[PDB]
Write an enzyme that holds these catalytic residues in place. Structure first.
Site, short mmCIF file in Angstrom:
data_model
loop_
_atom_site.label_atom_id
_atom_site.label_comp_id
_atom_site.label_asym_id
_atom_site.label_seq_id
_atom_site.Cartn_x
_atom_site.Cartn_y
_atom_site.Cartn_z
N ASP A 31 0.85 -1.15 0.00
CA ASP A 31 0.00 0.00 0.00
C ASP A 31 0.92 1.24 0.00
O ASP A 31 2.17 1.10 0.02
CB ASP A 31 -0.87 -0.07 1.26
CG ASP A 31 -2.22 0.71 1.11
OD1 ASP A 31 -2.27 1.72 0.36
OD2 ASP A 31 -3.22 0.28 1.74
N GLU A 82 -11.17 5.98 4.72
CA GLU A 82 -10.19 5.45 5.66
C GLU A 82 -10.03 6.35 6.93
O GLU A 82 -11.07 6.69 7.51
CB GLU A 82 -8.91 5.01 4.92
CG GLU A 82 -9.08 3.64 4.20
CD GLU A 82 -9.48 3.73 2.71
OE1 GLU A 82 -8.95 4.61 2.00
OE2 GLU A 82 -10.27 2.87 2.23
#
Ligand SMILES: *[C@@H]1O[C@H](CO)[C@@H](O)[C@H](O)[C@H]1NC(C)=O
Ligand SMILES: *[C@@H]1O[C@H](CO)[C@@H](O)[C@H](O)[C@H]1NC(C)=O
Ligand SMILES: *[C@@H]1O[C@H](CO)[C@@H](O)[C@H](O)[C@H]1NC(C)=O
Length: 607
Positions: free
Chosen positions: A289, A495
């Site tokens: 990521d 997020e």
């Protein structure tokens, strides 16, 4: 096989494994490490791509050639970058990735599908496959070959800011929704070995199962945090859909920011190499990521030499740097030169990266297809998104007493009606995060239909439609209205920005609902990424619909409100009575839900 200047890896008729082996054996260390490096288009130039032998690029959220760019501007930007990579000594094409997580959502004019939570409410895997299919076409319209999707997290606590990216708290639902994979990629052949990577060709894109593993299980749903659960719980809840992904040939897997029992996923050799590669037999590539390796340490980025060593020895193949490539490359080069990272590790990462590239046809079609440009926002895709929007809606209440006439379906012919609320005429809000910007945005950010617009499209020509964002109680009482539709709920987020401990919607929301419903019969449409405190909204409302984040096609909402189709959506998550109960999941301890998983009321189509 033929002409004197023949190079095996360039021969399209050869087996992928042979082409991989032939190319790998020609490569310098620099060429190898360059394949393992993915960078932001923001830091890319022709010289950088060539000089560093760069393997991949991405657009992070809102990283766009310019605001409002057309399909063709995207293609030209991608081809510009590809041209540079193709000019290297070996001419290895780059692969360009993007977060296309509910359509090609960074792009202006792209169809925007409901976010995954509402897709879960449909219990319709085949619908999700068709969404993967349409998303593939619209990503290729912009010349991009790789989507960072699906997110197969199993969100176990809706306080998590990414809960809306999870199809369900129940892994069986998530497992079923892995049909996004062969929609995005194409169906695998009947032969097909599980864990092999697959993409049908130039009209498909490589997919990415993410984020491995347990991203949905973090303490108090804190984003990027610790998932505390024994191996059995990990394997029973959070791991299963990864195997379905292996069986469907997912080409890539992205690692989680999260840790498992104190161990950072980005440094977890046991799970990444031991389980995913060695046990599930995954043969595509494993990607970090964004600054994922930096975040292994505390503080983040405080020992990058260690970030590189630990992530690469854990078994990651491609690092999403995404800005500091020179440092990444230098450090990785030094660790190899020093014998701290053996050549076999580099060679395995590059084998895997190249295997995905050859498999998907990237050496045969490294450039965009200008005739695909018209796939962007195609009406057929919008029709599909509208169907998905409608099937995702969960009817929580349709009448205050068992004896009231049910409010829904509402008549299309009425003398005068009210549409009200912060979310009734706000496209940005009905799309939520990861739309145009990273965090989403407010207002008319792309092409679509708001709830207000869908209402005006639906009603009889003699029905007078009045809009008021936040009307007071008097205005409603005096207005001569037959009923009102009032839409409220959450603001867009993604997020960490969306981690929320109170789960109560912003005002004015509840107050508008009370003001409206106090004057006239009302259908309340709740726009959210997850269950939120809802009892006060229920108490005020004749009918209440959980619409999640339905996307660009607001007529999906009104298709059901007005009875063109019956409501069929069912809760893919537990609806809590209070946040103090959390975490609380189907099957649990004392499980005491406001509405249990599977709950949804139904109606029938009018006529
Ligand atoms: C989880 O969040 C807490 C509180 O912000 C923080 O101190 C801790 O480092 C985090 N743990 C992780 C990321 O493993
Ligand atoms: C709920 O939490 C969010 C963000 O975590 C905050 O913006 C909002 O004001 C909070 N509401 C409260 C504490 O009532
Ligand atoms: C909806 O359909 C079912 C089965 O045909 C029936 O039980 C129900 O009474 C129907 N109609 C209405 C208007 O509620």
């Amino acid at each position: 096989h033929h002409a004197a200047d023949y190079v095996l890896y360039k021969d399209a008729t050869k087996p992928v494994e042979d082409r991989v082996a032939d190319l790998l054996g020609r490569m310098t260390l620099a060429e190898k490490i360059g394949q393992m490096t993915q960078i932001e288009r923001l830091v890319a130039t022709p010289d950088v791509l060539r000089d560093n032998f760069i393997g991949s690029l991405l657009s992070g959220g809102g990283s766009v050639p310019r605001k409002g760019a057309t399909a063709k501007e995207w293609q030209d930007m991608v081809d510009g970058f590809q041209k540079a990579c193709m000019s290297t000594r070996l001419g290895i094409p780059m692969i360009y990735g993007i977060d296309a997580v509910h359509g090609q959502n960074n792009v202006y004019g792209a169809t925007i599908f409901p976010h995954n939570v509402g897709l879960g409410a449909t219990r319709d895997p085949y619908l999700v496959k068709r969404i993967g299919e349409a998303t593939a076409l619209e990503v290729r319209a912009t010349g991009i070959q790789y989507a960072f999707a699906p997110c197969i997290a199993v969100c176990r606590d809706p306080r998590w800011g990414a809960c809306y990216a999870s199809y369900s708290e129940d892994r069986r639902i998530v497992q079923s929704m892995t049909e996004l994979i062969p929609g995005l990629q194409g169906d695998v052949p009947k032969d097909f070995t599980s864990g092999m990577p697959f993409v049908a060709g130039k009209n498909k894109v490589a997919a990415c199962a993410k984020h491995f593993v347990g991203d949905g299980g973090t303490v108090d749903g804190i984003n990027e945090n610790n998932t505390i659960i024994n191996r059995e719980g990990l394997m029973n809840i959070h791991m299963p859909a990864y195997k379905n992904a292996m069986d469907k040939g997912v080409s890539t897997v992205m690692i989680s920011y999260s840790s498992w029992n104190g161990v950072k996923m980005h440094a977890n050799q046991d799970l990444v190499t031991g389980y995913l590669k060695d046990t599930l037999k995954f043969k595509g590539f494993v990607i970090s990521d964004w600054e994922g390796i930096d975040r292994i340490t505390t503080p983040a980025g405080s020992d990058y030499s260690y970030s590189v060593k630990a992530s690469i020895l854990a078994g990651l193949d491609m690092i999403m740097v995404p800005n500091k490539y020179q440092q990444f490359i230098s450090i990785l080069t030094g660790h190899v030169n020093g014998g701290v990272i053996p050549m076999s590790r580099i060679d395995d990462a590059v084998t895997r990266i190249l295997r995905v590239k050859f498999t998907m046809g990237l050496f045969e079609n490294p450039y965009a297809d200008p005739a695909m440009a018209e796939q962007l926002g195609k009406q057929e895709h919008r029709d599909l998104a509208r169907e998905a929007a409608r099937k995702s809606l969960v009817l929580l209440k349709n009448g205050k007493t068992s004896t009231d006439a049910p409010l829904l379906p509402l008549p299309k012919k009425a003398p005068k009606i009210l549409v009200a609320g912060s979310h009734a005429d706000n496209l940005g809000y009905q799309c939520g995060g990861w739309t145009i910007e990273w965090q989403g945005d407010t207002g008319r950010t792309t092409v679509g239909t708001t709830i207000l617009e869908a209402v005006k499209a639906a009603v009889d020509p003699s029905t007078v439609v009045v809009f008021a964002e936040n009307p007071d109680a008097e205005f409603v009482k005096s207005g001569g209205f037959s009923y009102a539709i009032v839409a409220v709920g959450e603001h867009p987020y993604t997020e960490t920005k969306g981690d929320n401990l109170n789960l109560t919607i912003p005002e004015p929301g509840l107050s508008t609902v009370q003001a409206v419903c106090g004057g006239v019969r009302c259908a309340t449409v709740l726009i959210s990424g997850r269950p939120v405190v809802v009892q006060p909204l229920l108490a005020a409302s004749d009918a209440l619909v959980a619409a999640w984040l339905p996307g660009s096609e607001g007529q999906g909402v009104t298709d059901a409100l007005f009875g063109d189709f019956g409501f069929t959506g069912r809760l893919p998550r537990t609806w809590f009575k209070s946040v103090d109960q959390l975490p609380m999941n189907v099957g649990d301890a004392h499980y005491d839900p406001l509405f249990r998983l599977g709950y949804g009321l139904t109606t029938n189509a009018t006529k």
